[model samples]
Structures are given as structure tokens and as C-alpha cells.
Target: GSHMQYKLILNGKTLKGETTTEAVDAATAEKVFKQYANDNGVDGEWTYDDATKTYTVTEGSGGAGGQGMIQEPALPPGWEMKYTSEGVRYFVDHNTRTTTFKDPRPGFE
Candidate 1:
């Protein structure tokens, strides 16, 4: 069977993608996926590459020098840190608007 492309995009960005040919029902696929994740220590969201027989789970990018540290010396009295699969940022005064955002762009561009 020919492989199929699976793409998952969020917020105008390509977050996850994969190509696979393994045919399975939705329920069975879910179960198999959960098992695979458990076996590989991967989180739920991932992409399965049948050609390579590999599954990749995207995680947050580096913060600074791959240290994953917050650059801010101190909170602005209202900002707090929030983390997601994409990256980390500061929330403004209990709002989730993402006051600051950073991620690993190509070549740190």
C-alpha cells in the first residue's frame, strides 16, 4: 500500500506532520499509538514516519544556549511563565495572550 501524508498545523504554522501506510481503524490506531508512545516515552502528540519506522514528538525549543532558561531576571509583578509543546513565554497579568514568545527558528534567525 502507498503511504499517506498526515499534517497537523496550528496557528498558521506546521507543527506536526508524518507519512504512513499502515492501515488501521481509528480506535485500534489510537490504542496502538498510545502503546507506542508509552513504549518510546513519547507524549501523545507526535508524527509517525512509516518509511523510517520512527515517531517524533515535538518539544519546546531552546531558550538560551540550549539552557531552556528564562531570560527575564525578575517578573514584572504581573507576568508569569507558561510553557507549551511549541515553546515557552510569559503571560501578562493572568492573561494567556503571550506577552513574550521565543522559539528555535532556523539558524537562530
Candidate 2:
């Protein structure tokens, strides 16, 4: 038998991706992944590859260095500090239907 790809995209407070191909299956996808995510594994994949074995990973936060959900303090009072995946603290002025990334704080642009 040839090798097979085992993949998982579990969300344990953050997005994570994993893949391996060295004679694998639901045993790795469901069972191993289940233990890795505290019983929250979604599904698995069976992709093709030329290598005998393999795996995948990608490293990955927010706020003023502040996580982006603290509302505002001395801010324009109309913009929202809705941060994104990797510490991107942007702002959205729902009052004016606009979004800006110009320093969401009050006194600095």
C-alpha cells in the first residue's frame, strides 16, 4: 500500500492546519486530531503527493500589541477597534460606513 495524506483544520481559539502522509487515515485525522484539539476535530483529507511521507504547518494575535476588542479610550468615539488575525488593530466608523487603519488611538492620527 502507498502512503496517504492526513489533514485537519481544528479551531481551538485559533485556526490551525495539519497534514501528514506516511500510511495514514481517519485514525490519524479523527483519532489523533481529536486528542490534539480536545475532541473538536472537524474532518480530514486524502490528497496526493510524490514523497513517501510529509506534514504541514503555519505559525500564527491582536490589541495595541491591545487585542482590538476593548472598545475605545479617547478615540474618535465613532470608530470601532475591530482587530484582525495577526495583531492588526484597525478601526471602523460604522456611523459613516467607513474603515480606517490610521492609528485607532485618540491623539495620534
Candidate 3:
């Protein structure tokens, strides 16, 4: 299947996190950006420019940039949350903030 390639831009330069997938739409790209931001602790707003075929991430206030939770319990400052494709919910520990993949499904499984 033909998919779109996404590039992550920081400080006007491209970073090494490029993704190619068949689910290449703005909504899916948004998820990609969220996952990428969460994985890298990047604080910024991710925008997709159709004309340029790239995802542009503009820095936000400070710290890892991401869209706040819209449908779940609010996390403490400097913390981010994301749900996996398998229905697992995960959150970053505010006190010990680091880029580690933690599964929030200890009991759910």
C-alpha cells in the first residue's frame, strides 16, 4: 500500500524521526505526532502542511509539547498520557519524567 512519509522538524531543521505508514491522513498524522512527541519529550504544536507534505512541529510553551488530554482524568504538570492501539492507557510520571515506554495496563490485562 502506498503511504505518506512524515518528517519531524525542530528549530527549522529536520530530525531523525520519520514515519511511513498506509494510514496517512491528518487525523492519523496527528496521532503519529502525539506518539512521536511523547516518545521524544518534545514540546510543540504539530501541524501538517498538505502543500509541503511534511509535519511541522512548532514549539509550545516549554517542555515536551503535546495536546492535553481531552477525554480522561487530567494529569499533573509535565506529564503526558497516551492510549495504545490495543486499548492500553499510559501516562508519564510527573515526578520522574523520562522517555521510557511504560504500559498503563498492569491490571487491565
Candidate 4:
């Protein structure tokens, strides 16, 4: 599997967080951009630079760093879930174009 790394930019400033998309094609990269923005409540448009192989989000409204725990449903068709060593579940939704890392282990947040 191959994934692309993306940085979060808001108000012309880069945030501390970075996200990676699923192992797929460039179209999946676009979905990753939109999903990242929607998850963090960043109202913006994204531009993919082929030369740099990076995606930059130009926010139209709201700031970054407001992402909270995401509530997701059971694994759907075409979605992939991977369990980390610490029991965290990483889910990538190919249909809805969303991704989340959740720790379902007891007493973990």
C-alpha cells in the first residue's frame, strides 16, 4: 500500500498535524483533502501540485486544530480497518471519503 502525506494549512499558516491518505491513486488524494477539511471543520478549497506532489488547502473560513474524536459506524463495504499494536482502529472510508483513528480499547481515549 502506498499513501500520500499532507499538511494542514489554515489562514496561510501550517498546523502541527499531518494526515495520510489511503493507499490508492491521485483521486483518492483529492478525497483525502476534502475529508480532512470536513473532519476538522476547515472550510476551504484544496490544490494539488503535481510538481511538489503535495496538497495545499486554502481555507475560506474557520481556523484549524479543532478536530475532535470522530464517531464512525461499523465497517462498510470497500472500507478498510487496521488495528494498531495498541489496539487502536484505523479506518479508511473509500465510499464516504473519510478516515479516523479510534482507540476502542478500554480506558483509552
Candidate 5:
């Protein structure tokens, strides 16, 4: 009988241990793929192809480093929205290196 290995890869990097090994059941392969992605903070979504036997993930989107949301009012000068993996949102005014959880627009309070 023949067997296959579910190799997990992220953004072109091949996953190891959990993958690139001997044959494993579909369930186990899936389990390792998921845990590995989160364990290493792999970004973006995943694509597991039954035929290719490969788990693929992507890392995308502009977070804290990029510009603010085009729809929302832009923060004044050094102020910006901090975005993370879970989208943990907060406001930071680099002008003073202080941050808050609300819009920085003055006279709004």
C-alpha cells in the first residue's frame, strides 16, 4: 500500500515535525497544521489541499505600520490606530509616546 504526508507550509516556508514526515492520518495532519500555525504566529488564512497534501497559509494586511483606516477620521499627526493579530485596537499618540483606547480628536469629550 502507498502512503502520503501532509506537509505544512506557510508563505513558502515548509513546516517540520508536524509535517514533512512519514504518513499520518488525515485527522492528525489537520491537527498539527492548525496548532503549528497558531503556535508560530503564522499570519493570514490557510489552504489545505487534499490532492497536494500540503497545508498553506498566508500573511497579509497592513497593520500598525500602515496608514489608518481610510473611512475613519485620520488621527492628528503622530496619532494612529494600533492593530494586531486579533485586531486588538488602541490609539497611540507618538507625538508624546502616550496611547489611549479612544479617538484622539480634541474637544470631543
Candidate 6:
């Protein structure tokens, strides 16, 4: 069997105003999500839909830039957190300059 990809949607948008990384299982997802949320004071809340058997982050509060707890980042596949005025920013690797989120760099006016 192949691994399943869980879709984490915030608010009413799918993959909007946030970053989505890959996780193997529910436990990994929970761990990573919690770590990211709590570290950055994101005010993470979760809900389980039994019918779908999936977990989702319902709400969160934080700055656009990847600061705070969420900013620490997990060690895997060159994952890192860069704070922007919008939210926690995602990058491919440390050397990779381009951010998955637009205008993630500081002073991008």
C-alpha cells in the first residue's frame, strides 16, 4: 500500500495563507503541526472527522513572518521557517533563495 497524503486546510481556504509539508502518518503530522504551531504561538486547534479519519487544523493566530515557535523548524529535507509579514514562510532548503511564498524575504516592499 502507498502512503496517504492528508490535506491540511486553514479557515475556508485550501492550502491558503499557510504552508503544507509532507508527513508520513497521523502521528507525524500531529507532531510536526503541533511543534510548528506551538513554537510559533499559532494557537493551533484540531478536529477529527471520524467519517474521513483525518485531522485538520481549524484555526491559528500568528504573524506573516515565520517567527516565534513555528520559526524553529524541523530537521528534515532542508525544512526551515522564515517569517514574513503574512505568516510562517516555507523554503526548499537553506541555500535555496526562492521562497515558496512570495515576498517572504525581509524588506520586500
Candidate 2's displacement at residue 59, Å, is 18
Q: What are the root-mean-square deviations of the candidates from the true structure over C-alphas?
A: 16.2, 13.0, 18.8, 19.6, 12.3, 18.9
Tens-digit lDDT string for candidate 3 (1-109): 4676655564322433444434557678667667766666664766676786676666564565377555576565787887779976666666786544555565557
Better of 3 and 6 by TM-score: 3
Candidate 1 vs. true structure, TM-score: 0.27
Say which candidate scores most in TM-score: 5
> Where in model 3 is the C-alpha error above 4 Å?
12-22, 61-109
Q: State residue 45's C-alpha deviation in candidate 1, in Å.
A: 3.3
lDDT of 1 by residue, 9-103 (tens): 12113334333325334344445555654454445455555564454455433335756456567665656767667764435554554455433
What TM-scores do the predictions have? 0.27, 0.26, 0.39, 0.38, 0.40, 0.35
Q: Is candidate 3 or candidate 5 better by TM-score?
A: 5
Superposed model 4: Cα runs more than 4 Å off: 1-16, 61-109
Q: If candidate 5 were superposed on the true structure by all CA atoms, what would the RMSD be?
A: 12.3
Where does candidate 6 stray beyond 4 Å?
11-16, 50-54, 60-109
| Per-candidate local distance difference test | 0.46, 0.51, 0.62, 0.62, 0.66, 0.57
lDDT by residue (tens digit), candidate 6, 7-105: 454543333345565666777876776776555444446865656545566555544856555445355555565776877555555567455643346
lDDT at position 109, candidate 4: 30
Query: Which candidate model has the greater lDDT, 3 or 6?
Result: 3
Candidate that beats the other on lDDT, 2 or 3, i.e. the better one = 3
Instruction: State model 4's lDDT.
Output: 0.62
Model 4 per-residue lDDT tens digits across residues 1-109: 3554544444344443455554356777677667767666665566667775566676555566676544567665777888779976687777777886545665553
Please tell me which predicted candidate would have the highest lDDT against the true structure. 5
